[PDB]
Write an enzyme that holds these catalytic residues in place. Structure first.
Site, PDB file in Angstrom:
ATOM      1  CG  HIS A 277      -0.125 -21.867 -15.548  1.00 42.63           C
ATOM      2  ND1 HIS A 277      -0.949 -22.443 -14.587  1.00 42.63           N
ATOM      3  CD2 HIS A 277      -0.704 -22.136 -16.745  1.00 42.63           C
ATOM      4  CE1 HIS A 277      -1.976 -23.016 -15.200  1.00 42.63           C
ATOM      5  NE2 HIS A 277      -1.850 -22.848 -16.494  1.00 42.63           N
TER       6      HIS A 277
ATOM      7  CD  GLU B 137      -4.295 -22.415 -22.900  1.00 47.22           C
ATOM      8  OE1 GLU B 137      -4.804 -22.556 -21.773  1.00 47.22           O
ATOM      9  OE2 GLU B 137      -3.560 -23.249 -23.403  1.00 47.22           O
TER      10      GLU B 137
ATOM     11  CG  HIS C 126      -5.069 -20.299 -17.150  1.00 47.70           C
ATOM     12  ND1 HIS C 126      -4.829 -21.302 -18.088  1.00 47.70           N
ATOM     13  CD2 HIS C 126      -5.905 -19.413 -17.752  1.00 47.70           C
ATOM     14  CE1 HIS C 126      -5.521 -21.034 -19.175  1.00 47.70           C
ATOM     15  NE2 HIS C 126      -6.138 -19.892 -19.010  1.00 47.70           N
TER      16      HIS C 126
ATOM     17  CB  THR D 151      -5.876 -25.483 -21.305  1.00 43.84           C
ATOM     18  OG1 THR D 151      -4.862 -24.868 -20.544  1.00 43.84           O
ATOM     19  CG2 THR D 151      -7.197 -24.811 -21.011  1.00 43.84           C
ATOM     20  CB  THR D 152      -1.567 -28.659 -19.932  1.00 45.98           C
ATOM     21  OG1 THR D 152      -1.860 -28.649 -18.526  1.00 45.98           O
ATOM     22  CG2 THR D 152      -1.080 -27.325 -20.355  1.00 45.98           C
TER      23      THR D 152
END
EC number: 4.2.1.1
Length: 257
Positions: free
Chosen positions: A91, A103, A116, A195-196
């Site tokens: 994604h 990011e 990613h 990162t989420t």
């Protein structure tokens, strides 16, 4: 629930996911002048020749291109990794403007987007088990800049009209992720997190030094996606990036001088 808006964005995540203020959070700023060259780091082995993509999904935060990870069909090995990590999905994160979207940052510089490629350690049997382990995931991060088109991205761009809104999926077979790689596999590496949310501290990050270039038209198409479901108020899926987090007690290593 969590998102990237005024009231539910990254600065709020810690209320539901306290690990957001943990010791190994991602992304980070990569200070190229303080990363240490580690001559013992091995070349990455990227083995994507038998990759089987299945589907593309708008999950309300990004879109995921998903792969068959029930066999060793597309794997990452070597580099800083011990063992074999299987590709499950990729994604992107991107901006509303070309000056933001990544990011990770490099010497505080933001790229237009970041790819990613998510892989899980086969010793843990499935992705859900892997994310509970400190060495469960290996994420190959690749920066995108705007310039010439990336022909290997176009099939993705094409299908986005079929997955505009949250919850929509589309068949997406026979996509070759090798068309998204830069020439060089020189990298930085450090231990971090998703990162989420749930922000789990299970990732060996491998961030490539060389960006890929995509066209203005390609990024624009990303910015037409929607965070919302069909029939809900339209909110463009842009600026779906978490900012850099404190490095704390970590050293970024470089595979190259």
């Amino acid at each position: 629930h969590w998102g990237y808006g005024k009231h539910n964005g990254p600065e709020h995540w810690h209320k539901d996911f306290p690990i957001a203020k943990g010791e190994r959070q991602s992304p980070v700023d990569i200070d190229t002048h303080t990363a240490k060259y580690d001559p013992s780091l091995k070349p990455l082995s990227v083995s994507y020749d038998q990759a089987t993509s299945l589907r593309i999904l708008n999950n309300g935060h990004a879109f995921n291109v998903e792969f068959d990870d029930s066999q060793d069909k597309a794997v990452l090995k070597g580099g800083p990794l011990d063992g074999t990590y299987r590709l499950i999905q990729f994604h992107f994160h991107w901006g509303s403007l070309d000056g933001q979207g990544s990011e990770h940052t490099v010497d505080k510089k933001k790229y237009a987007a970041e790819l990613h490629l998510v892989h899980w350690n086969t010793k843990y049997g499935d992705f859900g088990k892997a994310v509970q382990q400190p060495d469960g995931l290996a994420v190959l991060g690749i920066f995108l800049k705007v310039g010439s088109a990336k022909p290997g991205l176009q099939k993705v761009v094409d299908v986005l009209d079929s997955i505009k809104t949250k919850g929509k999926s589309a068949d997406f077979t026979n996509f070759d992720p090798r068309g998204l790689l830069p020439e060089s596999l020189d990298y930085w590496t450090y231990p971090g997190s998703l990162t989420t949310p749930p922000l789990l501290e299970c990732v060996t990050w491998i961030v490539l030094k060389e960006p890929i270039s995509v066209s203005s038209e390609q990024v624009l198409k990303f910015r037409k996606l929607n965070f919302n479901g069909e029939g809900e108020p339209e909110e463009l899926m842009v600026d779906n990036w978490r900012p850099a987090q404190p490095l704390k007690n970590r050293q970024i290593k470089a595979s190259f001088k």
